[PDB]
């Protein structure tokens, strides 16, 4: 019977390919082409945040659009004031092998985790001035590659187990588990309506996850290798992805097709992080050559370069009001660019 | 009057920075070791005699060593291995002679060695269970590695007096298969430190201390290299 199922899968793959080819009446490059270019985009470092003793694995902007949380190998999370450069908090971790972190949208708590296979939630609104773990989420068996917060006490996590899950931080329980990837899940990005989530993985694919249903609505392909970072286009119907094949791709969720690719002959560096500016016109990407590039998202050209890191770029983030770009790296310094 | 908040923030920053400076002093004095290796290599006997990541703490000559042991994210393994590039050393455990476990160990070794993010990390190599090899050999390498048929020990070999010559050539053959990988690349940016062992004592295991001493000395000398 196995042979029949194999044949059905191949027939369905072709039905999908034809359904997608049917929509190929344009490329983004034939739609945008007469649009004025962004021109040269330049940025300067305005602030440098010093204090980590080791490489930064993760960084995240809060919603007040002023605070940053960053995580590093030496065992600490640091909560920074992006305007004054002062440290607000420094949080010791039980295990130093931290790969990810996230700041709650309410500003009340911080998540982190890594090779310990535990997502630990810290309560910042502490009566003692002592930031303590309020809860630990465990049930994952692989490393935690990414976690993102939802309101109503929920967190979305992804791991090296090839799965993703929705947790209730009241009980320490999973309510929903998302499956279907074959490789490690490398990243999560929440839709603006936080009902759809997108999951990137080491099988060169990305999936659009229906949060309330607990199922995959749509699978996107196009990359040659592992996807390291995904971010949603601000207006909800497209996501940009970056991978180890040293290119970025723009995906169209309504057409179910890649829409545009971003590449250059002189880039053989993997992409470690991607993010969008508020208009969705500037696509930022961090690379293995310790540069970050700024792409013209509609024309696929290079608008500019952010140089000034002495090691691998590990993470990008753009504050919600669009005022600044923060870049974390393996050289242990977190810089704010404007 | 907002100046009162500015004063409070500065004092909070001062307490935090003082604690970070104390931790920096501890961090630099603590060595980090990764325990990595082939399946059924005896990783457990190296750690016994010497939920994710397990950690064992050791002290030798007032220096502190933390070793990260074995389990969790164990097999996949290309994305988490990068977390361990900032270590003093990787301790790679391979048992000396089913599947061709030694060829697998050799491929795993090369995958450390030529990885662009592990290019500066030295490897302490333990060829374990030398007693297993001795019994299998005197009673097996050439079935998987035909080159062994023509192998002789080097003039620099130091066999245990009374040890069977077929075993001594087997031990050195295996060691050399790992070394020929190490000698092919880096140009001296990283080093391999092979040892022959068994689950018998800590005299050879304590060589981790001595290898760390050599690894750190080599790093310190980089600041004094000339243009």
């Amino acid at each position, epitope marked *: 019977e196995l042979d029949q199922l194999r044949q059905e899968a191949e027939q369905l*793959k072709n039905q999908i390919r034809d359904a997608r080819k049917a929509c190929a009446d344009a490329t983004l490059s034939q739609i945008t082409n007469n649009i004025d270019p962004v021109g040269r985009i330049q940025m300067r470092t305005r602030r440098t945040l010093r204090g980590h003793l080791a490489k930064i694995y993760a960084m995240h902007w809060g919603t007040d659009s002023r605070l940053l949380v960053s995580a590093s190998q030496d065992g600490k999370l640091i909560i920074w004031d992006s305007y004054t450069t002062n440290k607000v908090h420094a949080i010791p971790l039980r295990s130093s092998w931290v790969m990810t972190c996230a700041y709650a949208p309410s500003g009340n708590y911080v998540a982190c985790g890594g090779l310990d296979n535990i997502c630990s939630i810290y309560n910042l609104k502490t009566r003692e001035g002592n930031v303590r773990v309020s809860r630990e989420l465990a049930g994952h068996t692989g490393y935690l590659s990414c976690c993102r917060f939802l309101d109503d006490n929920q967190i979305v996590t992804s791991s090296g187990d*090839t799965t993703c899950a929705l947790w209730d931080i009241e009980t320490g329980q999973q309510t929903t588990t998302f499956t279907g990837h*074959t*490789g490690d899940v490398m990243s999560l990005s929440l839709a603006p309506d936080t009902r759809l989530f997108v999951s990137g993985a*080491c099988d*060169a694919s990305a999936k659009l996850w229906d949060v309330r249903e607990g199922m995959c609505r749509q699978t996107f*392909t*196009g990359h*040659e*290798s*592992d996807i390291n970072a995904i971010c949603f286009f601000p207006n909800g119907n497209a996501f940009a992805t970056g991978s*180890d*094949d*040293a290119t970025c791709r723009l995906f169209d969720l309504r057409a179910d097709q890649e829409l545009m690719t971003y590449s250059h002959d002189n880039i*053989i560096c*993997g992409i470690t992080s991607v993010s969008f500016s508020k208009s969705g016109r500037l696509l930022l990407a961090g690379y293995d050559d310790f540069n970050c590039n700024v792409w013209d998202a509609l024309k696929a050209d290079r608008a500019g370069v952010l140089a000034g890191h002495d090691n691998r770029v590990s993470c990008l983030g753009v504050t919600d009001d669009g005022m600044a770009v923060a870049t974390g790296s393996w050289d242990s310094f977190l810089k704010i660019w404007n | 009057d907002q100046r009162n908040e500015e004063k409070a923030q500065r004092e909070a920053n001062k307490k935090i920075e003082k604690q970070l400076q104390k931790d920096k002093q501890v961090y630099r004095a603590t060595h980090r070791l990764l325990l990595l290796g082939a399946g059924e290599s005896g990783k457990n006997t190296i750690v016994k005699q010497m939920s994710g990541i397990f950690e064992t703490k050791f002290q030798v000559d007032k220096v502190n060593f933390h070793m990260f042991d074995v389990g969790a994210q164990r*097999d*996949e*393994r*290309r994305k988490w291995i990068q977390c361990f590039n900032d270590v003093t050393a990787i301790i790679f455990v391979v048992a000396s002679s*089913q*599947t*061709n476990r030694l*060829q*697998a160990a050799l*491929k*795993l070794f*090369d*995958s450390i060695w*030529n*990885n*662009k993010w592990l290019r500066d990390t030295s490897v302490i190599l333990f060829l374990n269970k030398q007693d297993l090899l001795a019994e299998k050999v005197l009673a097996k390498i050439e*079935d*998987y*590695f*035909p*080159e062994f048929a023509r192998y002789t020990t080097p003039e620099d070999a130091t066999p245990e007096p009374g040890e069977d010559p077929r075993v001594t050539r087997a031990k050195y053959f295996i060691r050399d298969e790992f070394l020929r990988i190490s000698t092919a*690349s880096g140009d001296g940016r990283h080093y391999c430190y092979p040892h022959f062992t068994c689950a018998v004592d800590t005299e050879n295991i304590r060589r981790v201390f001595n290898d760390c001493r050599d690894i750190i000395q080599r790093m310190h000398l980089r600041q004094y290299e000339l243009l």
Partner: nanobody
Amino acid sequence: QVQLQESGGGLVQPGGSLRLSCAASGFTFSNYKMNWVRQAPGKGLEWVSDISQSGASISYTGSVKGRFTISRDNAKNTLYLQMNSLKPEDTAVYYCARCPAPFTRDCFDVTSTTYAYRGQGTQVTV
């Protein structure tokens, strides 16, 4: 979607030979290394042969030296394994694994349970 499709397996008597190959699709690989991987009945997966993207062979497992050879043709996106005189021990499923990244020297883990499916595969019985 990246694809690697194997063909050319079947039954050969001891002392005979096979030519196995994979057609690659969905990618540019002139930038990538290729690996032949084998799974004997009752065993896990073992590495057999490794060719660089330049066309130069790098290595063979010792047990196949002088018996198996490999080659590639970047003009047609194909990978080949020539299996000369075979023994009963060579009965296995053959796979065309590829390395995870372009322009590199490291390559792992091409024999793992969930990686090594790339290029899955064909049965050769001696």
